[PDB]
Write a protein that binds this ligand. Structure first.
Ligand SMILES: *[C@H](N[C@H](C(=O)O)[C@@H](C)O)c1c(COP(=O)(O)O)cnc(C)c1O
Ligand SMILES: *[C@H](N[C@H](C(=O)O)[C@@H](C)O)c1c(COP(=O)(O)O)cnc(C)c1O
Ligand code: NA
Lengths: 410, 410
């Protein structure tokens, strides 16, 4: 029994297992993976150096590795309807770096969604390799509707003439029109890359239209709504782009891939291919709308864009508490975790923000329904309204514990 | 029961466990990690997004994650004697990229060891981001001795004027003088980076001199001789460099770290801090030298630099078989896996090579000693000498199964 050797590490792991059980997880990026996904990434596949690609490895004794990686590739292709897939990127960020490396050059102009409106760090932040290598120029949402305006974006693309347009977001509640993004790209001879990290599970379940037919390349995390292990994935229908993508991932950016994690990708993709996964996506949408509807109806809260068609939404909380940061800290005291989040045209410090971001996937994976989602959102309103009344927080904490005890994590 | 849901995947994982058991693994980069290491990266730590650093995370619910990551940081600093450690890099390649991003700017001149004498792809290959982003100039070993010639490297550095010198290798058998590399760097006003991936377990065991007091920045994999999970690690004594490295890893190059893998790093680093790790390192050295001695004494084979003072060595096989690829294929027939390898000043195609690379770490971790290591190298000589006699290969394959049955993998 190995755990007696290292009690400080194994006690910390027991403490994190207890924190996840005793926590209402509303961070829109989080999920609860299956025991099968965890077991695959705890295998002796970690021992094998798999530099290269199936049948084209730097080393031998890789014929079983090749079967595992090919299952992950074949499942990604089947699940997303893509002719090519690369399952080696270590993360979403590495996936994105490989696509930029394949399609554009340093100094090339790129349009990505503004970081205040849900663009990722890797879509042009100045502190990211993305903004350091490439000239990123943001598009935003409409100032009043807080929706993407495909006319304003086309007009801006004709001025900017980007080599590449990046679509996809971390904090956008509405359906992104990939057919329109491809039209905008075509009108200026740009590539279109879609980073579907937040929405890949909903793409896989049928609850969000797929970018895969419209983007020259689609990137995603295997984690978030897809409910996989942490890692990246790249999809394309173009055979010449596929060759470039493969070279960019290895030996361009990475070395040996994590074949234990790729086994876990292959596990998670077979789960998403199952009819049960459609049911998962349905509850994800229902649960998110139920929570959004509680803030919509309360007069002291505005849901950004007025609602959600996906797993998440933002709330301006500044009427009820000073900033998103305070909202986060308060809800932490009743064992509800979400994050402070900038809202569109954020006016406060990015360290404070006006917003909270809420998602349904993790509570949905714990088997919660619209009733429990509505209930969680009522608790959130009540904790924020009573942020200075310690014995009200005390009481919500107790009510939360009855709910978590009722929906065991594992 | 989860295995019943996906037999194709779980059959392949069971087959890799049995393949690792029934094969003699001599790939110098491979090892057999502990049950504790595999179990740690199979935990529900994969469900927690930990963007940022301990005490300074993007999201809440990270209090326990911070204890796990801080354990990995403190155990790295203690084991390698460094004032700072970063345990987030997904891989050795991502570690190296963050160091270049910290110390130099695109187009700067870098010296790195020649890919034929053991330099990694990330040490300037033109197919790597390293050779595409930076102006790499390679240094070699001496043609006659096959040893690093620190006077010749000094004279080249004074001509080339690098901003950065990278030392460390994947096919060099002799003790590196890190004090000499830092004297060379200081003589030309360059940074010294040491990638100690191959030798890190021998630096930990006390069998190889540490680069940590001499390199501005030390990179490593947590896998290979250190016997950790697949990932990377960065060390420095310089507080200003540490702040740059941290910002380069995240948000510079990566997003969210793999905290389940970081738990596994913490497990491995505590294993390497144990007095039994010194005995491992001693057996690694003795077992590699017992294999090298078989090839040294045999007239048809030559060991690159005449032997080894670490875990690996290279053998020119071209008097017995056409090329290293042939030698790798023949040994695979008798369930011995190693890799063809370029030898210094390699004349054949890089796809063929003159050489094989042999390491001791995997067989040492299985409990094998010097008598087993010698028997293994006698079987390699016999199989290469008798490559065209199927009845000989059949017999060695049967003798190899008696040896693997006697030293079970787990
Ligand atoms: C995930 N980013 C999440 C989010 O949900 O806000 C937080 C953790 O930043 C993400 C990624 C992540 O790539 P990683 O695996 O390197 O961390 C990439 N792309 C998008 C769109 C995204 O939401
Ligand atoms: C590992 N290179 C080895 C080798 O043994 O030849 C094989 C596995 O390519 C290695 C790395 C690898 O980084 P990774 O985690 O990105 O694959 C980095 N640096 C050195 C010196 C090294 O040997
Ligand atoms: Na190592």
């Amino acid at each position: 029994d190995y755990k007696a050797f290292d009690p400080e590490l194994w006690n910390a792991i027991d403490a994190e297992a207890e924190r996840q059980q005793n926590n209402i997880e509303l961070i829109a990026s989080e999920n609860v993976v299956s025991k099968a996904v965890m077991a695959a990434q705890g295998t002796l596949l970690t021992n094998k150096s798999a530099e290269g690609y199936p049948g084209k490895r730097y080393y031998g004794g890789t014929a079983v590795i090749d079967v595992v990686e090919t299952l992950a590739i074949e499942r990604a292709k089947k699940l997303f309807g893509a002719k090519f897939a690369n399952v080696q990127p270590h993360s979403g960020s590495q996936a994105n770096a490989a696509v930029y490396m394949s399609l554009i050059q340093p100094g090339d102009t790129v349009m990505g969604m503004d970081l205040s409106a849900g663009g990722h760090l890797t879509h042009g932040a100045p502190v990211s390799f993305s903004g350091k290598t490439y000239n990123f120029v943001s598009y935003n949402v409409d100032k009043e509707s807080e929706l993407l305006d495909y006319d304003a974006i086309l007009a801006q693309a004709k001025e900017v003439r980007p080599k590449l347009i990046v679509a996809g977001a971390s904090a956008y509640s509405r359906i992104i029109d990939f057919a329109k993004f491809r039209e905008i790209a075509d009108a200026v001879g740009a590539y279109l890359m879609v980073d579907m990290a937040h929405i890949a599970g909903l793409v896989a379940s049928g609850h969000h239209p797929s970018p895969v037919p419209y983007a020259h390349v689609t990137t995603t995390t295997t984690h978030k709504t897809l409910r996989g292990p942490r890692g990246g994935l790249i999809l394309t229908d173009d055979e010449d782009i596929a060759k470039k993508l493969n070279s960019a991932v290895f030996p361009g950016l990475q070395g040996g891939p994590l074949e234990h994690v790729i086994a876990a990708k292959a596990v998670a993709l077979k789960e998403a291919l199952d009819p049960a996964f459609k049911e998962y996506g349905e509850n994800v949408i229902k649960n998110a709308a139920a929570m959004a509807d509680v803030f919509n109806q309360h007069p002291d809260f505005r849901v950004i864009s007025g609602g959600t068609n996906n797993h998440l939404f933002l709330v301006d909380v500044t009427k009820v508490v000073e900033n998103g940061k305070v909202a986060q800290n308060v809800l932490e005291e009743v064992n509800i975790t979400l994050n402070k989040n900038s809202i569109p045209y954020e006016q406060l410090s990015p360290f404070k923000t006006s917003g909270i971001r809420v998602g349904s996937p993790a509570i949905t994976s714990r088997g919660m329904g619209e009733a429990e989602s509505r209930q969680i959102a009522e608790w959130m309103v009540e904790a924020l309204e009573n942020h200075d009344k310690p014995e009200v927080l005390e009481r919500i904490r107790g009510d939360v514990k009855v709910l978590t005890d009722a929906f065991p994590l594992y």
